[PDB]
Amino acid sequence: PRYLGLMSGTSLDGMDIVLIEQGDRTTLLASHYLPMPAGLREDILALCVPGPDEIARAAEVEQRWVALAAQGVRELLLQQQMSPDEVRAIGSHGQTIRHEPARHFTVQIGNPALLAELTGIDVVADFRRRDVAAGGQGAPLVPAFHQALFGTSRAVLNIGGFSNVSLLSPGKPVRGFDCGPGNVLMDAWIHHQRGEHFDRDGAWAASGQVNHALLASLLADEFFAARGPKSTGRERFNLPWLQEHLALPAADIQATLLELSARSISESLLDAQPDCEEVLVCGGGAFNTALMKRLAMLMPEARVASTDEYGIPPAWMEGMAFAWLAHRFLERLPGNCPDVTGALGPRTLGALYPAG
Amino acid sequence: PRYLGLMSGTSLDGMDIVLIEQGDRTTLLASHYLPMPAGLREDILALCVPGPDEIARAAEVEQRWVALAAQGVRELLLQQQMSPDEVRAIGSHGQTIRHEPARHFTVQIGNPALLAELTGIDVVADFRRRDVAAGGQGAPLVPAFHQALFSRAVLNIGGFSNVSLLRGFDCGPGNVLMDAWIHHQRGEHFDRDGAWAASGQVNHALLASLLADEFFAARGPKSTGRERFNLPWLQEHLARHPALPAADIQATLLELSARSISESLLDAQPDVLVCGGGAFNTALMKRLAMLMPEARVASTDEYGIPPAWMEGMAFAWLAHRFLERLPGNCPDVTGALGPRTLGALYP
Numbered sequence A: 001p002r003y004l005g006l007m008s009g010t011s012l013d014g015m016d017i018v019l020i021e022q023g024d025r026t027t028l029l030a031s032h033y034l035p036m037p038a039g040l041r042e043d044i045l046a047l048c049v050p051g052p053d054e055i056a057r058a059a060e061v062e063q064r065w066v067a068l069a070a071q072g073v074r075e076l077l078l079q080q081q082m083s084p085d086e087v088r089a090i091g092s093h094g095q096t097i098r099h100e101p102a103r104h105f106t107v108q109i110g111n112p113a114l115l116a117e118l119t120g121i122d123v124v125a126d127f128r129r130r131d132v133a134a135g136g137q138g139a140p141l142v143p144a145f146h147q148a149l150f151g152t153s154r155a156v157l158n159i160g161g162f163s164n165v166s167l168l169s170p171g172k173p174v175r176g177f178d179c180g181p182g183n184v185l186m187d188a189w190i191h192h193q194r195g196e197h198f199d200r201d202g203a204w205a206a207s208g209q210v211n212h213a214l215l216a217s218l219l220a221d222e223f224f225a226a227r228g229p230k231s232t233g234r235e236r237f238n239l240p241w242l243q244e245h246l247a248l249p250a251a252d253i254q255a256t257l258l259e260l261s262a263r264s265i266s267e268s269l270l271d272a273q274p275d276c277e278e279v280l281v282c283g284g285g286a287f288n289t290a291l292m293k294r295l296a297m298l299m300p301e302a303r304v305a306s307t308d309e310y311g312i313p314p315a316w317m318e319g320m321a322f323a324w325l326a327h328r329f330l331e332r333l334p335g336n337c338p339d340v341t342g343a344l345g346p347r348t349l350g351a352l353y354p355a356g
Numbered sequence B: 001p002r003y004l005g006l007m008s009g010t011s012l013d014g015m016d017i018v019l020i021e022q023g024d025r026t027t028l029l030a031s032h033y034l035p036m037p038a039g040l041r042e043d044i045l046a047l048c049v050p051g052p053d054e055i056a057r058a059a060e061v062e063q064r065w066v067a068l069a070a071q072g073v074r075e076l077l078l079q080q081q082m083s084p085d086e087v088r089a090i091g092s093h094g095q096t097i098r099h100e101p102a103r104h105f106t107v108q109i110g111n112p113a114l115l116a117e118l119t120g121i122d123v124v125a126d127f128r129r130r131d132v133a134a135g136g137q138g139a140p141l142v143p144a145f146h147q148a149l150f151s152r153a154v155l156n157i158g159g160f161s162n163v164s165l166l167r168g169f170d171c172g173p174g175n176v177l178m179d180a181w182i183h184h185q186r187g188e189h190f191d192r193d194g195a196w197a198a199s200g201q202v203n204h205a206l207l208a209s210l211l212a213d214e215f216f217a218a219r220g221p222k223s224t225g226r227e228r229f230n231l232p233w234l235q236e237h238l239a240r241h242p243a244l245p246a247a248d249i250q251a252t253l254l255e256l257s258a259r260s261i262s263e264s265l266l267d268a269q270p271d272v273l274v275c276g277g278g279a280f281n282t283a284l285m286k287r288l289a290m291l292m293p294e295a296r297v298a299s300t301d302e303y304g305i306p307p308a309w310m311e312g313m314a315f316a317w318l319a320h321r322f323l324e325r326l327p328g329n330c331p332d333v334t335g336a337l338g339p340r341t342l343g344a345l346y347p
């Protein structure tokens, strides 16, 4: 059947909507991007830390997030000349505002009932919560999808705000984990500094020089040393965390942050899978040519290429994964990988809000 | 099939678990009550008003609420000699911590994913949200159930009172103020048999001042909660007159619930089945019988259903309705645009 995938990751660049055909295989039929309005992006970031009146605030931000999503869904369907009745379901990741697997909770907003009401399409949402309930990290969730798409020893690497890898070693459980920062700090820094939203092509970082004293200080953070099932978010790597370390030319700090993402990816990758022959890059980090060059030279044993070479545009991989999870829900097939998340075992992920 | 109903209303007395058989009819197979721990009750009440760190706090309270719930489900099933696999699904109402239909939102916590994980039974939850999305109040939800079960008025008296005219709406305070007052005063949780209220005398100046509140004058689809009727609201009214005997304020609160129920009821249907814990307030039951002399005022016990478990039964029933893809709201009770499938499935 046909599924919609609705993604809005921690970078807050915008909302991704994908349409896939699912049968034997997964095929991208169409994609649709709606940029995040500055007001909504800042209100979401404001919910990402503890604060007052969060229940009412989150409910109001939620309404706006869903209105935007449903707008995107309607535009996409009209542009593809298809009615809502041709889509089996929407896989909605929602919007994470708090991810605390050490406190056994993760909070994704995105009023799926209102999404069902606005779209006329069944919604599958709230994927991470069952994995956490079964003792897991609730992240990463893409590995089951990466395996189904690309399961030779391959690593599939997502570089969004944070980086995560899916290690596909034949005759083993799928393994994976969040490597650490992807674009999050490089975004945070060029925003604190130049007001910008990201460092295009990594050209600002390229103009700088790595500071080895800063780099080693950042690498020595406790998260990097941990092995196996691990996840992170805006809770650990953020601007106030960088400044605590900084306490030097701005461009140099930017070069150093790019290196931190390159190094924390290679070392966590090659440690867990030295035989890695192939590294498939997805997410918006795949477009950072500077970062892509550093990854190719820190893992010389493997070919470092974007998923575009293998038939999937790197920007839509995550959205495709969430549409795919709606299908898994509806077929009653497990969505997590217990050895990625550390959950007790395989679980059906999500809940169904029917259009009715 | 067999369904579990999980209810924990606004009074926070405890958690109700019911087992029903559903086919042609709805039959109560078993019930199970777990009192609310004082710690958990107070932390829930603390989430019922704006405050700091609510997302983390609500998530932690939720974990405890669901652990308790699952504990009750397991005890009940063991005691009835049945495995989780004989139950089709759990209908979970969750716990309301904020209901604001005028702001188009209602917030019921109760981590259904964790409830499914702990029980091994499919969970249907988050019933009110779709009705609110379709422009409704998201309350009351019991009228579709009352209609399937039973010119009658079916009257639930929990923290708040609602009636199903066989249309419906929340009449106003049930036990909420009488509970709030005997707790502010005597530390107690409720006024047993309404014996404290019975020992007092109604103050007509206070009563008329309370009845003149804007909510009572409104007609048709309306809902309320701890947001409107609460202790700080009563005290605001008590300040106008000088000191007044506590028992007399209690008698007056009981009268306010009796009057707001009769007048809203008889207005909308001049031509009465009592459920909820208010059915056990004999003092209130006596005043209701004398304020509506046209009708027989009896508890649902006379009609085959224990008044304490009616709401839990309603939510087990709503799980069935979800699974059969049948509407769960009554558009003319809630003011939603039309019939909707209520809830979401956590398998």
Ligand SMILES: Nc1ncnc2c1ncn2[C@@H]1O[C@H](COP(=O)(O)OP(=O)(O)O)[C@@H](O)[C@H]1O
Residues within 6 Å of the ligand: A008, A009, A010, A011, A012, A013, A014, A159, A160, A161, A162, A183, A187, A197, A198, A199, A200, A201, A202, A282, A283, A284, A285, A287, A288, A289, A315, A318
């Ligand atoms: N042309 C580009 N050059 C360098 N970086 C880019 C480019 N395009 C996107 N990015 C980076 O990728 C990020 C967004 O990628 P995305 O996969 O959507 O992450 P997320 O799902 O967490 O929002 C942007 O914030 C930006 O840092």
Ligand SMILES: Nc1ncnc2c1ncn2[C@@H]1O[C@H](COP(=O)(O)OP(=O)(O)O)[C@@H](O)[C@H]1O
Residues within 6 Å of the ligand: B008, B009, B010, B011, B012, B013, B014, B157, B158, B159, B160, B175, B176, B179, B189, B190, B191, B192, B193, B194, B275, B276, B277, B278, B280, B281, B282, B308, B311
């Ligand atoms: N024996 C009793 N005497 C007087 N009031 C009672 C008695 N038993 C229960 N109640 C009232 O019923 C309330 C709880 O009933 P309930 O139907 O569960 O409402 P809710 O949905 O708000 O939890 C108590 O707080 C109390 O006021």
